[PDB]
RNA sequence: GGGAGAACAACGCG
RNA sequence: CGCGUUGUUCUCCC
């Protein structure tokens, strides 16, 4: 429906559609397209929490701005899962995506059935 | 009724009972006593709002601490009136005077009679 | 990654 | 002085 830009650069980031919600708080984003748009760098302290565990961080790729994205995780069987911040982002036209949130229906719950389907 | 003291170097500041609210925001303190428990420098960026004039700042007459209190302003007839930041003090005992205000009574609106018998 | 917490440095309105 | 906002640091829980 709605697309989110890079806070910092207000480069495009993904679609409200390619977002999945993970035990009602993380934000993960669907899609091989979406992992161009992001670099990583590894991450200096490791941490496992939730079903998570930490693989590295997401920045943006554009490399004048490198704006912190989130993080990259293994949950389940399913690794380098993106996992977005959501206070990095911004909505296209101005709002940020926290308010657009707020303001909106639930994003789609994350169905490891349809994972299944799109990384077999 | 509860004592006030210097955030930062835990000095007697004042009594609730001497304190009073303009406006339900400014809170100032009545009597000579506490001005020997500051020392103030001339406002650095003079500013007028509601009834006040600025006209210095306040710090804790701690050599060793100096924290920031306030500033003094002339209200009315009332100059060097001292006006506490109510961040820069923590309540004997520990909790600080603003979750001490949460939980108690409201402290007494200025009365400006009371003040013409104090100041005449 | 989400939820809180505290500190510092500043920006805006009165 | 109140109010609202930012950046950063530290920490807790998950
Ligand atoms: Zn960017
Ligand atoms: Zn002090």
């Known amino acids: 429906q709605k697309n989110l830009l890079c806070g910092k650069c207000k480069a495009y980031a993904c679609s409200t559609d390619d977002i999945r919600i993970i035990k009602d708080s993380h934000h993960i984003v669907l899609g091989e397209a979406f992992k161009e748009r992001y670099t990583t760098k590894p991450h200096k302290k490791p941490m496992q929490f939730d079903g998570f565990e930490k693989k590295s961080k997401m920045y943006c790729?554009?490399?004048?701005?490198?704006?912190?994205?989130?993080?990259?995780?293994?949950?389940?069987?399913?690794?380098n899962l993106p996992v977005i911040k959501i206070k990095s982002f911004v909505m296209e036209s101005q709002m940020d995506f926290q308010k657009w949130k707020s303001?909106?229906?639930?994003?789609?719950?994350?169905?490891?059935?349809?994972?299944?389907?799109?990384?077999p």
């Open 61 to 79: 790729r554009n490399n004048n701005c490198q704006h912190d994205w989130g993080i990259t995780v293994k949950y389940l069987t399913f690794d």
């Open 103 to 119: 303001i909106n229906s639930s994003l789609k719950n994350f169905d490891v059935e349809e994972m299944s389907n799109l990384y």
